[PDB]
């Protein structure tokens, strides 16, 4: 028996990864704009 997983399984991999570090700056162009007003 063989299995393994593909490309998209990659993709959502990755996807991760870019959507909770920018979480991260979501709140960082809150933490710097907040200091703006």
């Known amino acids: 028996f063989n299995y393994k ?3 998209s399984f ?3 991999a990755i996807s991760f990864l870019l959507t909770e570090s920018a ?4 709140v960082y162009l809150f933490m710097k ?3 703006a007003e």
């Not at 979480?23 to 979501?26: A, R």
């Open 23 to 26: 979480g991260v700056m979501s």
């Open 33 to 35: 704009r907040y200091t």
């Open 5 to 7: 997983y593909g490309w």
């Open 10 to 12: 990659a993709f959502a």
